[PDB]
Design a protein around this ligand. Sequence first.
Ligand code: NAP
Length: 293
Amino acid sequence: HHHSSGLVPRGSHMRVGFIGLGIMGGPMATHLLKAGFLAAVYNRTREKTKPFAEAGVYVAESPADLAKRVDVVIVMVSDAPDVEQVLFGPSGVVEGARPGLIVVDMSTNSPDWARKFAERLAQYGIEFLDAPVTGGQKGAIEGTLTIMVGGKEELFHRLLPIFKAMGRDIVYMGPVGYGQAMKLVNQVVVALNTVAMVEGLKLAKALGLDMDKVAEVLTARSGAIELYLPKLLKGDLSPGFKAEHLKKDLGYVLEEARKRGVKLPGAELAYELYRKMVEDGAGSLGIHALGFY
Ligand SMILES: NC(=O)c1ccc[n+]([C@@H]2O[C@H](COP(=O)([O-])OP(=O)(O)OC[C@H]3O[C@@H](n4cnc5c(N)ncnc54)[C@H](OP(=O)(O)O)[C@@H]3O)[C@@H](O)[C@H]2O)c1
């Protein structure tokens, strides 16, 4: 069946449907709406779609119902199994998409997962990019994300106006999976920079240092410090970036390391620390709460 017009003209071939309105996906999709690309959203929990519906965005009943109405599906759900559900479940994207639709997975998983998604989608005539991001919740909100992309370079170029609505530095990394590859390098760094900050703070507190001055001196400076030290000092342990998601990222890091015969003892330790945090019931706190939960 064909369908009625929506927010974005069909002849643009740039109608976007966005799946996963979380800490990242809400602000990202809002930036796409402000830029005139957002036609539709889907979220597993319907309440989060409310602010979109109040701006006229179509609220889909399933990923399939979203896919049949758009040219580009952006996915920003938690983990690779969640991407599998939204793409390939009973009412997943593949049940609604027409050939030539592009899926862009902006969530974090792995090169191997990116390649599997692309392979499976190509059987339906659906294109794929892996385009994970860095910059945190604050970057999402500000529209300044760094976006690292794998897949056909021609599709990277075609979608650059969409990426520029959400981010600032848009980097083409190579074939399918090279965006996830970059993102997993990035997550090694983020994890250990976060452990750095937390251990520094634990030592500073034990020594009874003036936190104002600690923050001044450390702002040693890193991403984690700039994004999360103010929250941490106020005891705001909310994400931010959930500990369970970093655990997940570090699992893929260590799988890739093992596949390639590289030893990453720091990443192994980080994985252990974040694994304990999830076991202890703090998986939904931000990563900056490590050591403090
Ligand atoms: N937060 C950060 O700083 C940050 C930065 C860069 C990249 N990332 C990555 O971006 C991705 C999203 O992160 P986030 O911080 O936005 O996570 P989040 O706040 O936990 O949101 C997760 C989103 O995924 C949806 N979801 C999860 N499982 C699903 C399933 N099986 N089916 C359908 N929807 C599902 C959730 O739906 P509900 O609303 O129903 O729960 C929610 O919309 C993750 O891969 C994360 O690692 C995060």
